[PDB]
Design a protein around this ligand. Structure first.
Ligand SMILES: CCN(CC)CCNS(=O)(=O)Cc1ccc(Cl)cc1
Ligand SMILES: CCN(CC)CCNS(=O)(=O)Cc1ccc(Cl)cc1
Ligand SMILES: *[C@@H]1O[C@H](CO)[C@@H](O)[C@H](O)[C@H]1NC(C)=O
Ligand SMILES: *[C@@H]1O[C@H](CO)[C@@H](O)[C@H](O)[C@H]1NC(C)=O
Ligand SMILES: *[C@@H]1O[C@H](CO)[C@@H](O)[C@H](O)[C@H]1NC(C)=O
Lengths: 535, 533
């Protein structure tokens, strides 16, 4: 010590940390980046549950983000900001179980509500070190404590041979849980209140927030939750034991390999060799489907999410759920022929047809037909513009919008307090074409408050708007209610009830209350197709 | 002896009667026989042309109404009784009526032939709603309406038999059509300008005269009001017709020849008493004795026939009313009455869906309930009531109409589509029924012009507009008065634009898509569902 900033030195259960004084446009913030919460899950620890980090000697430097968990990298659009912004911005390693903490400068006097971020990226990608997950603005402007872990993704996080000792699966969710316990024990040394922990995540992250709600051991580690454009219930967020087993055995073949002697060979494999064959175990040509995701194992998940969300009691739970306007436009350029970010993606009815078999890969021709019939505009059934807008709406409604409404309805029926939003504002900074509208994950840069960075060239309204959202999110984190108690003049935001089904619009304009979250089109997806597909 | 009231036709001489319409006199020739009485051994048999008569025949009254079931539901209620027979029931039905202006036209005048409805089980040309005097007096029209055998007597079939070949009720129409070809000039009618127009079962009949080649020499234009040849209720198969006939015989106490034989030895009411008991499921908007795919009158199913036809010189006028389903709910669906408000449960809604669509499997019924439920208020008994009515109207009329209007246009026909959205100020049914099946008719025929009917002064003007549309269509195959402007114009229905107009007190409003989404569900999806399973 001696000559160092005395306000950036903190001790946690593993040892001492030297953090860093970061600059935010309105003032300084404290950051602790690269704090290990687990033993490096490498060698014989690959595919295994995480063990707590062995305490270190001396002071650990916590000024830089640590390694990103081994994952697939986007090669579709090289150097294109709209894709690279999600790409790994640190070195790739199986040694990746580190978490980051943001705090005001100096650190808070009173115990301060905690915000824990879980990134998305369909369980195959993501990192807490990305610019869009920068907790410096929430900590500066809202005075919040913000933690964000790294969890194992893809093969390393979710490959399972259910019932085995050497690959029980779901271990990426275990990484997340260990970080939640870490917060319970250590967050006080930063001014964090471990009795006011709010989870929030997006896509796969939102999904896992859901899974912590549905998993008992995790239910002690938080008090409120936010699910942004993702759910534990649905088509992509889970697989069966048999199906997970199938994808694991198949992968072993593709790379050269009794579950023991099988996994033993897998551990002798280079990490890239597993990444390079990951997409090959999908049973159908699909989009919005990911190879290695949470498995229903009768442990972390006692039953299916749908089962659990139907039976379970959520009397004293507060949830904030919501979706963006165009949840599906993003995925179309990654699989559906006719689609690209460089043209207007005007498609034929024949291409709309093929796309439905891709967006809904688990559909018999009859169910597929039903989808085509529902989404067709029989006044203009050949209009390329409408077909395009409907292709994205299929993918959007099927994977996010309807599972969310399904979830927002069950929770709200079984005791939970539920607030719901639609995010409708297209960033002026968006690098995607206009036809994609408000794509998947583009509310994130507004929750974290990036428009506050003057170098980013946003607008004054986008600034205020970003400010307003951070209020909603933080107010919800401490109160369980996004509404400000002082300000009663401005519009209110009612809970989503089964009765009225109210939700709010999130745009540059004041709150607008709307009833019914794609009510008709979702009763299609949520009530009918499961019955149809039963035969 | 008024020489205007004296006509000579191929069978002899007729004396009409000079009738009083509020704007002038008309000539009426009522009770003219076009066929030998289909009695005794002529039951279930094709009609024969009427043998000539001596002296001057008295054509001043409506003849008897073809023998049929008579409604017992609401005795004395003028909304049910207005469809009930106003003459005496007899198997001596085969007579027709003719209205012309007075004096008769000096020039060959286009003919309108009304084919009544009533589910192929009832109906008569003598009803006051079918009073063809106003169209003749005001538009200068030659108007014809025939009787045709209904129910068992017109449609009981034992396919392949010589003595119960089926579709005879349709052949009665065909004969009255040939009659007009032969004798209409005598009254002043242009037999080269003949327009068929009918409602419900009659619109279906009209549709089959389009689909049957021998009939195609008998007219040039058609109008289908709230009914189609295609659909769930308008035809049966040979197997099913044979089934119902064989069953009815069992019910009344009766080889083909030896079965139709014993049937002829039965009083009419003994057949009517068991008419409904042959329906396979508890249904509504389903009729026991209707036209049948015989391979003769109907070479194939109407669907298979409309899918392959060439209508490159046909001109059609099709349409529906607002609430094509309200009428049929009080006749079976629990919870429904015209005396309360029929706010219903949800189990009640599912119960009715099973009855309105008795053809549906468990899954297809579910599909119906899911589609029609308003998930914002999925237990609102007011919406559930309105939806039960909509399931029935769309399944049985609206979507079939849309299906047909599309195929005709696609295959060369010139089709005009409407929807009747006005509810009469004199309507005696409850409000929740809105504009029920058959309530465009009072207005097409011009009943408002009868001052005793207490219609409003705007309903009077509205009727005159429709009469103009219908007659203009008959004269030209185009509903548009070639003297107007701006309104705008009633445009042809196309497979592309799917344009149609609405008929109410306000001027013409052009709309696009006739339940386009809801019908794709009916026309395209539900078959494939059951077609699979
Ligand atoms: C959570 C953030 N997302 C949404 C923008 C970032 C991108 N990744 S994604 O999983 O959403 C879509 C995807 C899928 C398969 C392939 Cl090969 C590539 C991309
Ligand atoms: C001119 C055609 N209609 C339209 C109102 C007159 C009578 N109505 S109807 O016969 O069509 C319907 C019906 C069905 C079954 C029974 Cl038991 C009673 C009525
Ligand atoms: C858009 O891009 C894709 C990929 O190149 C291509 O398949 C499609 O033909 C393009 N559409 C247009 C309108 O050029
Ligand atoms: C906005 O500021 C200027 C505009 O020319 C530019 O140099 C800078 O790169 C822009 N910022 C971004 C990243 O859009
Ligand atoms: C409507 O009438 C039916 C038949 O009488 C009856 O069962 C029902 O109670 C009535 N519905 C009401 C009162 O809303």
């Amino acid at each position: 010590e001696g000559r160092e900033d005395p306000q950036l030195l903190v001790r946690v259960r593993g040892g001492q940390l030297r953090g860093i004084r970061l600059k935010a446009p309105g003032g300084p913030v404290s950051a602790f980046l690269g704090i290990p919460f687990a033993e490096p899950p490498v060698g014989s620890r690959r595919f295994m549950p995480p063990e707590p980090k062995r305490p270190w000697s001396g002071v650990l430097d916590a000024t830089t983000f640590q390694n990103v968990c081994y994952q697939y990298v986007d090669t579709l659009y090289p150097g294109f900001e709209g894709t690279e912004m999600w790409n790994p911005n640190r070195e790739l390693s199986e040694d990746c179980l580190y978490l980051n903490v943001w705090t005001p400068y100096p650190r808070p006097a009173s115990p301060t509500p905690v915000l824990i971020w879980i990134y998305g990226g369909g369980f195959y990608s993501g990192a807490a070190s990305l610019d869009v997950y920068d907790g410096r603005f929430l900590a500066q402007v809202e005075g919040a404590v913000l933690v964000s872990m790294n969890y194992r993704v893809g093969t390393f996080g979710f490959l399972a041979l259910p019932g085995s000792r050497e690959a029980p699966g779901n271990v990426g969710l275990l990484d997340q849980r260990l970080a939640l316990q870490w917060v319970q024990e250590n967050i006080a040394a930063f001014g964090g209140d471990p009795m006011s922990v709010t989870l929030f995540g997006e896509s796969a992250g939102a999904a896992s927030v859901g899974m912590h709600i549905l998993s008992l051991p995790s239910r002690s580690l938080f008090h409120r939750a936010v699910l942004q454009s993702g759910t534990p219930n649905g088509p992509w967020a889970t697989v069966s034991a048999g199906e997970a087993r199938r994808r694991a055995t198949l992968l072993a073949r593709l790379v050269g390999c009794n579950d023991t002697e099988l996994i033993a060979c897998l551990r002798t494999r280079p990490a890239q060799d597993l990444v390079d064959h990951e997409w090959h175990v999908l049973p159908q040509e699909s989009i919005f489907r990911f190879s290695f995701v949470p498995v229903v194992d009768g442990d972390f998940l006692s039953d299916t999410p749908e089962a659990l969300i139907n039976t379970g009691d959520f009397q004293d739970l507060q949830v904030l759920v919501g979706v963006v306007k165009d949840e599906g436009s993003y995925f179309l350029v990654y699989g559906v022929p006719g689609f690209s970010k460089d043209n207007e993606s005007l498609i034929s009815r024949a291409q709309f047809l093929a796309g439905v078999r891709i967006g809904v890969p688990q559909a018999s021709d009859l169910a597929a037909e039903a989808v085509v019939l529902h989404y067709t505009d029989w006044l203009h059934p050949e209009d390329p513009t409408h077909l395009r807008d409907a292709m994205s709406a299929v993918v959007g409604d099927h994977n996010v919008v309807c599972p969310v409404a399904q979830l927002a309805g069950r929770l709200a029926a079984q005791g939970a307090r539920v607030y719901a939003y639609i995010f409708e504002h297209r960033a002026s900074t968006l690098t995607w074409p206009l036809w994609m509208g408000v794509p998947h994950g583009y509310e994130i840069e507004f929750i974290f408050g990036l428009p506050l960075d003057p170098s980013l060239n946003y607008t004054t309204e986008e600034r205020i708007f970003a400010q307003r959202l951070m209020k909603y999110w933080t107010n919800f984190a401490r109160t369980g209610d996004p509404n400000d108690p002082r300000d009663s003049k401005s519009p209110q935001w009612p809970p989503y009830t089964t009765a009225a089904q109210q939700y709010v619009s999130l745009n540059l304009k004041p709150l607008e209350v709307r009833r019914g979250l794609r009510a008709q089109t979702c009763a299609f997806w949520n009530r009918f197709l499961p019955k149809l597909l039963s035969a």
